[PDB]
Amino acid sequence: GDRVITTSTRTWALPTYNNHLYKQISSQSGASNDNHYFGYSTPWGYFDFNRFHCHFSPRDWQRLINNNWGFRPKRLNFKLFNIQVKEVTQNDGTTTIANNLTSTVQVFTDSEYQLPYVLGSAHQGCLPPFPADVFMVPQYGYLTLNNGSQAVGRSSFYCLEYFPSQMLRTGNNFTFSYTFEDVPFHSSYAHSQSLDALMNPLIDQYLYYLSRTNTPSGTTTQSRLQFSQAGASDIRDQSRNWLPGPCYRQQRVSKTSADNNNSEYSWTGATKYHLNGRDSLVNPGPAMASHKDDEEKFFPQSGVLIFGKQGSEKTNVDIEKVMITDEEEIRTTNPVATEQYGSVSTNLQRGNRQAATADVNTQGVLPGMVWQDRDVYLQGPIWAKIPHTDGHFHPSPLMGGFGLKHPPPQILIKNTPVPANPSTTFSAAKFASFITQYSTGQVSVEIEWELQKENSKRWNPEIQYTSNYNKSVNVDFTVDTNGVYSEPRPIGTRYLTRNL
Amino acid sequence: GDRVITTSTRTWALPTYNNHLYKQISSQSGASNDNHYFGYSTPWGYFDFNRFHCHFSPRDWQRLINNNWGFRPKRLNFKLFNIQVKEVTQNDGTTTIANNLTSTVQVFTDSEYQLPYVLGSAHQGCLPPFPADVFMVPQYGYLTLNNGSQAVGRSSFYCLEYFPSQMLRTGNNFTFSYTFEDVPFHSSYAHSQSLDALMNPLIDQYLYYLSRTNTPSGTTTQSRLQFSQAGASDIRDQSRNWLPGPCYRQQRVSKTSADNNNSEYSWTGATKYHLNGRDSLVNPGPAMASHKDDEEKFFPQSGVLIFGKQGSEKTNVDIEKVMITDEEEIRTTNPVATEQYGSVSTNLQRGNRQAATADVNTQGVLPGMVWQDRDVYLQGPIWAKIPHTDGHFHPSPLMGGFGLKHPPPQILIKNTPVPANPSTTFSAAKFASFITQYSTGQVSVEIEWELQKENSKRWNPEIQYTSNYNKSVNVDFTVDTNGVYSEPRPIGTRYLTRNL
Amino acid sequence: GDRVITTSTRTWALPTYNNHLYKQISSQSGASNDNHYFGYSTPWGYFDFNRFHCHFSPRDWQRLINNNWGFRPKRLNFKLFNIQVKEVTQNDGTTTIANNLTSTVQVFTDSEYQLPYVLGSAHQGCLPPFPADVFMVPQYGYLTLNNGSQAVGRSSFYCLEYFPSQMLRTGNNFTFSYTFEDVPFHSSYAHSQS
Amino acid sequence: QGPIWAKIPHTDGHFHPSPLMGGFGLKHPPPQILIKNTPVPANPSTTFSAAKFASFITQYSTGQVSVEIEWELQKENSKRWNPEIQYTSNYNKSVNVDFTVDTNGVYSEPRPIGTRYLTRNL
């Protein structure tokens, strides 16, 4: 009631990747100097389970999303069990399996966050949406530092066979518990009222701003400047003690595709920054914006988010599959998307001298700013692991989600190598001749989120996202015919409304 | 001694507004699309008492303002009593009153801040300056959300007859206590010394900056670049570890009115931003600036504050009544008003290539910024109720004053309707035929502010705002002849000086 | 959580109907013989509050309707208070009010269900939807038995001034508590499958 | 906007009472509680009299009212995998939303509602 407890489980399959041998991986020499990566590929595999798919399913997303203002995770517990090591041999056109029993698997974990922590991109393949079937574990490895291809001093290279591990035979299991520290609840409410009008419309404030300057002489010219008390009426002159959050700009692009010159403006016309002289564009903006009321056919080029419609073939797939989140609901506070934040004076005015204006395309944070977060679509990420640093400035990760400083640990996996027969003559160096095998087992987690209840004295119904209706040949979600699973539309949580 | 306790009281009068019936209120269709408001008007009335007039009077403003570095409120208590319900009937050219006794009045309050909290603009009519006479209570009602006129989903509409109330007959009273959480003391000291010179003038620092580049060959041209250790002398090259606060720009306008082209530049030339595509100008700037030393005839167009000289007829009143606060005292740190914050390089320089500069009109917050607040004029507001949000970035409300997250509650009032005689035939629907009546009573509050004392080892006298002198035909403040009350000049608190 | 508690309140106005005199009421003789009613009209007025408007408002209807399979009422409590008797006089083209104080009002109740219980049709005028304004109390009276217009033996005619009442001056209030016995929960679920 | 309890008549032949209006079948419904305001005559004629004069003093009355209920409800739990219907407020830019007063103080209530939304397998 006060808090909800989630539990999941899955089965998984672990191959062997590098042939049990680290391989440094680097960028191609033909890759443009905007792109160079120099790094390592380890055999170890690792679990992810960072996304909301794992823990909810649509119904329990409603039950959560409609009834609560906010929530946070209060702990988690985690389990591996039913570990079944398995062998495979290929003779000629023949196959075999024959589980080999006593062979083991290595796991450990890091509380110390010592090893490089890489999730962060929401790389695909965390866990299957929907409980059925199975997923093969992805392997590890990391970029570090490059310069132009090549290498520089420092440049890391950890080992991963150092740390005390645990070696788990068939019929042995592994767990650990973890507890989040705390974070402010994630927002849900949609902010009934905009900032621009917070005011009682009936009375009028006692400040006069400045009325029409100039005024006729005579019929023409005087420097007379007069004042008019504000309130009701024109509004828009209201003295206001708060400010809307910061923004840049984006290149507006239409889903209609009736427009946009020919043209290729991307990525040339896109917004980007270059760190260390290598251009980098910005996929999430600082979480903000919208398109605008009544438009819906325009969206920011690099803004918002994509996802996609299964099955989605990468690299040049057309618009129908992508799904393009709208982001319209934060319109209350954040300063929309592609607009000049607002005009500001430039040149002073003499008797002979006209004044600008000339405005601006950006702002930056200022005292008295307020802004809201972003929304989380349940196929999105969860926690971002703020880097270990100084200059935080509170961490509202652009992906959305929680800002953990000590995220849940990482827990890589590997299955111990078994050599084939040696030559008995001793030898130079190290033979490979490995015995091909892989592994499988279960997995669990659980969370126990804590959520704050909802209460409001509003008189009328509210929105409360629904299942829609009416005779779709294929409803959604649930499998169509031959076993493929679907997920039409994104969801995200802002529905309940709180007065600002 | 350690802390001062304030107490006030007044008498008040409550009419009946809507005829006891909610009326949705909307913007005119002829109102330009920059202006649309769609909202409600409830019968309920409400108290304000948010301004400094209520609690002090000029003398006790001195006694406070001169002797203390800073202060904050530590609690308050509040009272209604001596409630006298009253009736009025009009027959023909006749009048009558005849207090009706047992009829009641409804009050309650909200600690939960559930209902929309609207003060925020310093709408006129809180309480009378000066204890005499009486004030009629303003009514409630709120804007919420519009789009273009019209309406959208959400859009609120609370009731106000839901909550448990208290119904107070003649000879019954009502109170409650409230306690502020805490806030840093409000500043007073004026910062004796500017940032630019913090340094001991006698010694010189050991960093060399960069001296004249170029230098003659020969007599003309060399790329020679040489260095000169700083200190004393030129100054202005001093390495400095702190930065002045952020700013925009304003349109400078003269009180002299000898200038400014013809011209109407307002509001076209004014500084503004448009949220959701509707332009909004900025009445308080981010609290900052000044005009400059020795000028005093120039002030920012949209900057500073107005107030006005009683009696002040709204809409086009001339300059003599407005009073135009100067804001000169923060000159120490904040970066004045209409000036380019400062130049910054633009293009690199080759052997053939000249460099800019080209500067900037704005900045935004940066690490190592410092700035000071604003000053509070005792006819200004007090607490702003920071909205319930995430992105605070400490709340220094542009109106000035304290940043309460849980402000003192709101406490609306209404007087229960009494119908006239029915028709005994039963009826359709609901008759009105109300009995015209209104109400009156007392009011109290009190605060008990806590203030920190002042001590300084300065050797010489200080400024300490005074009453001036010399044979004014009308002193100030105190009533002139026929009972009208005056308040010449604003006041505000920065007088005592602290070394920075 | 387990159970929700509702509370409402309203203001109301009570006229005087028959001039304080019972009047037997009957069907018109011209009314077709499919229609004949023979009955009484008493001065007494009565409260209704039997409809869901009174207790919920749309939002709290959602909050209920979406989250639960079923429900039943487990009790109720009831109150009258702030009773203000009032007078009206009409001289010529003039009006007056002048609350008269000590005059009283009579109420009682029936647990025994003795008197004819008539609600049953959802006659209009129970309470106002929405809290505002006010509603005038409807009067009582009942049909019993007719034959063709006229009357037959039996045919009732209660009094209503028999029972012990309570007479409530200004500055006096009245309550009682009541408890439902039990009923199976009302259904909500829509039955997924035929 | 419908009724609530029907007061099954005092009888024999019940055959469980599912009142056609809908709502609960109480055998002992909440009581009835009629009201009346005592008559005050005008001045008599002092000559005594036949019969009974009327000459009443016109008056009426007003006051408050309360009730309350405390319903008991059973919670909902279902293992269904997909969203459900859950009646909503609709959307989209109605010149007049619903319910809440339009302009001059009249109150509205568009559409009926009724409760069947949540789904249980039969």
Coordinates of C-alpha atoms in Angstrom, one line a residue, chain A residues 203-454:
Chain A
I203 CA -7.6 42.8 -8.5
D204 CA -4.6 44.7 -10.0
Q205 CA -1.2 45.1 -8.6
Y206 CA 0.0 48.5 -7.5
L207 CA 3.1 48.7 -9.7
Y208 CA 2.9 50.9 -12.8
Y209 CA 5.6 49.5 -15.2
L210 CA 5.8 52.0 -18.0
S211 CA 2.9 53.0 -20.3
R212 CA 3.2 54.5 -23.8
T213 CA 6.2 56.7 -24.2
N214 CA 6.4 59.4 -26.9
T215 CA 2.8 60.8 -27.3
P216 CA 1.8 63.7 -29.6
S217 CA 3.1 67.2 -29.0
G218 CA 0.9 68.7 -30.5
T219 CA 0.2 66.1 -33.1
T220 CA 3.7 64.6 -33.5
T221 CA 6.6 64.5 -31.2
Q222 CA 7.3 64.6 -27.5
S223 CA 9.6 62.7 -25.2
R224 CA 6.8 62.5 -22.7
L225 CA 6.9 59.2 -20.9
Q226 CA 3.9 58.2 -18.9
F227 CA 2.9 55.3 -16.6
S228 CA -0.1 53.0 -16.3
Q229 CA -0.8 50.8 -13.4
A230 CA -1.0 47.1 -14.4
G231 CA -3.6 44.4 -13.8
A232 CA -6.4 42.6 -15.6
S233 CA -6.8 44.1 -19.0
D234 CA -3.6 43.9 -21.0
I235 CA -1.9 41.6 -18.4
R236 CA 1.5 40.7 -19.8
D237 CA 2.9 43.7 -17.9
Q238 CA 2.6 41.9 -14.7
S239 CA 5.5 42.0 -12.4
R240 CA 6.7 38.5 -11.9
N241 CA 9.1 37.0 -9.5
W242 CA 10.0 33.8 -11.2
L243 CA 11.6 32.8 -14.5
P244 CA 11.3 29.9 -16.9
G245 CA 14.1 27.4 -17.3
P246 CA 17.1 27.6 -19.7
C247 CA 17.2 26.5 -23.3
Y248 CA 19.3 26.6 -26.5
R249 CA 17.5 26.1 -29.8
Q250 CA 16.8 23.2 -32.2
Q251 CA 16.3 22.8 -35.9
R252 CA 12.6 22.4 -36.4
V253 CA 11.7 19.6 -38.8
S254 CA 8.3 18.5 -40.0
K255 CA 6.9 15.0 -40.0
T256 CA 4.9 16.1 -43.0
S257 CA 8.0 16.2 -45.2
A258 CA 6.4 18.7 -47.5
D259 CA 9.1 21.2 -46.8
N260 CA 12.7 21.6 -45.6
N261 CA 14.2 23.0 -48.9
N262 CA 15.5 20.1 -50.9
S263 CA 17.4 19.4 -48.6
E264 CA 20.3 17.9 -46.7
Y265 CA 21.0 20.2 -43.7
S266 CA 22.0 17.3 -41.4
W267 CA 24.2 17.1 -39.7
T268 CA 25.7 20.3 -41.0
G269 CA 22.7 22.4 -39.8
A270 CA 22.3 20.4 -36.6
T271 CA 23.2 21.8 -33.2
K272 CA 26.4 20.4 -31.8
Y273 CA 29.5 21.1 -29.8
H274 CA 33.1 20.0 -30.3
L275 CA 35.1 18.9 -27.2
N276 CA 38.8 18.5 -27.9
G277 CA 38.2 19.7 -31.5
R278 CA 36.0 16.8 -32.4
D279 CA 32.3 17.7 -33.2
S280 CA 29.7 16.1 -31.0
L281 CA 26.0 16.5 -31.5
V282 CA 23.4 16.5 -28.8
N283 CA 20.8 13.7 -28.8
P284 CA 18.9 14.6 -25.7
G285 CA 18.6 18.3 -25.3
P286 CA 18.6 19.7 -21.9
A287 CA 15.3 18.2 -21.0
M288 CA 12.8 20.7 -22.1
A289 CA 10.4 22.0 -24.7
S290 CA 7.6 20.7 -26.8
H291 CA 6.6 21.6 -30.3
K292 CA 3.8 24.0 -29.5
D293 CA 0.0 24.0 -29.2
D294 CA -1.9 22.9 -32.3
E295 CA 1.1 22.0 -34.4
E296 CA 2.1 18.4 -33.7
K297 CA 3.6 18.0 -37.2
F298 CA 6.9 19.8 -36.2
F299 CA 9.5 18.4 -33.9
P300 CA 13.1 19.3 -33.0
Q301 CA 15.7 17.7 -35.2
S302 CA 18.1 16.5 -32.5
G303 CA 15.5 16.9 -29.8
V304 CA 13.1 14.5 -28.1
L305 CA 13.6 10.7 -28.4
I306 CA 13.0 7.9 -30.9
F307 CA 12.7 4.3 -29.9
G308 CA 11.1 2.3 -32.7
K309 CA 8.6 -0.3 -34.0
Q310 CA 9.6 -3.9 -34.0
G311 CA 11.0 -5.3 -35.9
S312 CA 13.2 -2.3 -36.8
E313 CA 15.9 -2.6 -39.3
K314 CA 18.7 -0.2 -38.5
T315 CA 20.4 2.3 -40.8
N316 CA 18.0 4.3 -43.0
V317 CA 14.7 2.9 -41.9
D318 CA 11.9 5.3 -42.7
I319 CA 9.7 7.4 -40.4
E320 CA 6.8 5.0 -39.8
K321 CA 8.6 2.8 -37.3
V322 CA 10.4 5.4 -35.2
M323 CA 7.5 6.8 -32.9
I324 CA 9.0 10.2 -32.1
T325 CA 8.0 11.1 -28.5
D326 CA 6.1 14.4 -28.5
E327 CA 7.2 16.1 -25.2
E328 CA 4.3 18.5 -25.1
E329 CA 3.4 18.4 -21.4
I330 CA 6.1 20.5 -19.9
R331 CA 4.9 23.5 -21.9
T332 CA 3.9 25.1 -18.6
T333 CA 7.4 26.1 -17.5
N334 CA 10.2 25.1 -19.9
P335 CA 10.6 27.6 -22.8
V336 CA 9.3 25.4 -25.7
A337 CA 11.8 24.3 -28.3
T338 CA 12.8 26.3 -31.3
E339 CA 12.3 29.9 -30.2
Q340 CA 14.6 32.8 -29.3
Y341 CA 14.4 32.7 -25.6
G342 CA 13.6 36.4 -25.7
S343 CA 14.8 39.8 -26.9
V344 CA 17.2 42.0 -24.9
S345 CA 18.4 45.5 -25.4
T346 CA 21.6 46.2 -27.3
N347 CA 22.3 49.9 -28.2
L348 CA 21.5 52.9 -26.1
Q349 CA 19.2 55.6 -27.7
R350 CA 20.1 59.2 -28.0
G351 CA 17.9 61.9 -29.6
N352 CA 19.2 60.7 -32.9
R353 CA 19.9 57.1 -32.1
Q354 CA 17.5 54.1 -32.5
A355 CA 17.6 51.1 -30.1
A356 CA 17.8 47.3 -30.4
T357 CA 16.8 44.5 -29.2
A358 CA 18.6 42.1 -31.7
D359 CA 17.6 39.4 -29.1
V360 CA 19.5 36.1 -28.4
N361 CA 19.4 32.4 -29.3
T362 CA 20.4 31.1 -25.8
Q363 CA 20.3 31.8 -22.1
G364 CA 22.0 29.7 -19.5
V365 CA 21.0 29.4 -15.8
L366 CA 20.1 32.5 -13.8
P367 CA 18.8 33.2 -10.3
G368 CA 15.1 32.6 -10.1
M369 CA 15.0 30.0 -12.8
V370 CA 12.7 27.0 -12.4
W371 CA 12.2 24.1 -14.8
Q372 CA 10.8 20.5 -14.7
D373 CA 12.9 17.4 -15.3
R374 CA 11.7 15.2 -18.1
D375 CA 9.3 12.2 -18.4
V376 CA 10.2 8.5 -18.3
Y377 CA 8.7 6.2 -20.9
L378 CA 9.0 2.8 -19.2
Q379 CA 11.2 1.6 -22.0
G380 CA 13.7 4.3 -21.0
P381 CA 16.6 4.1 -18.5
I382 CA 16.4 4.4 -14.7
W383 CA 19.6 5.5 -13.0
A384 CA 22.5 7.4 -14.5
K385 CA 25.5 7.0 -12.1
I386 CA 26.6 10.6 -11.8
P387 CA 30.4 10.6 -12.4
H388 CA 32.7 11.1 -9.5
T389 CA 33.4 14.8 -9.6
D390 CA 33.1 18.3 -8.1
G391 CA 30.9 20.4 -10.4
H392 CA 27.6 18.5 -10.2
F393 CA 24.9 21.3 -10.4
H394 CA 22.2 19.0 -9.5
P395 CA 22.3 15.9 -11.7
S396 CA 19.1 15.7 -13.7
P397 CA 20.4 13.1 -16.2
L398 CA 19.4 14.0 -19.8
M399 CA 18.1 10.5 -20.4
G400 CA 15.8 11.1 -17.5
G401 CA 15.7 9.0 -14.4
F402 CA 17.5 8.9 -11.0
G403 CA 20.9 10.4 -10.3
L404 CA 22.5 7.7 -8.1
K405 CA 26.0 8.4 -6.9
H406 CA 26.5 4.8 -5.8
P407 CA 24.5 2.9 -8.3
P408 CA 23.8 -0.8 -7.8
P409 CA 26.9 -2.8 -8.7
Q410 CA 27.8 -4.4 -12.0
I411 CA 28.4 -8.1 -11.5
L412 CA 30.1 -9.5 -14.6
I413 CA 30.1 -13.2 -15.5
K414 CA 32.5 -15.6 -17.1
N415 CA 32.7 -19.4 -17.5
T416 CA 36.1 -21.0 -16.8
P417 CA 38.0 -22.3 -19.7
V418 CA 38.7 -26.0 -20.2
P419 CA 41.6 -27.0 -22.4
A420 CA 41.7 -30.0 -24.7
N421 CA 44.4 -32.7 -24.4
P422 CA 48.0 -31.5 -24.3
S423 CA 50.8 -33.0 -26.4
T424 CA 52.7 -34.5 -23.4
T425 CA 56.0 -33.4 -25.1
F426 CA 55.6 -30.2 -23.0
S427 CA 55.7 -27.1 -25.4
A428 CA 56.4 -23.5 -26.0
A429 CA 53.9 -20.8 -25.1
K430 CA 50.2 -21.5 -24.5
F431 CA 47.9 -23.7 -26.6
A432 CA 44.3 -22.9 -27.1
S433 CA 42.4 -26.0 -28.1
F434 CA 39.6 -25.0 -25.9
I435 CA 36.5 -27.1 -25.3
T436 CA 33.5 -25.3 -26.7
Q437 CA 30.8 -24.8 -24.0
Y438 CA 28.3 -22.4 -22.8
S439 CA 26.0 -21.9 -19.8
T440 CA 22.5 -21.1 -18.7
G441 CA 20.5 -20.4 -15.6
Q442 CA 17.9 -18.2 -14.0
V443 CA 17.9 -14.6 -12.7
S444 CA 15.6 -12.7 -10.3
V445 CA 16.1 -9.2 -8.9
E446 CA 13.2 -7.5 -7.2
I447 CA 13.0 -3.9 -6.0
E448 CA 10.4 -2.6 -3.5
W449 CA 9.9 0.9 -4.7
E450 CA 8.5 3.5 -2.3
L451 CA 5.8 5.8 -3.6
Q452 CA 3.8 8.7 -2.2
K453 CA 0.1 8.4 -2.4
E454 CA -2.1 10.8 -4.3

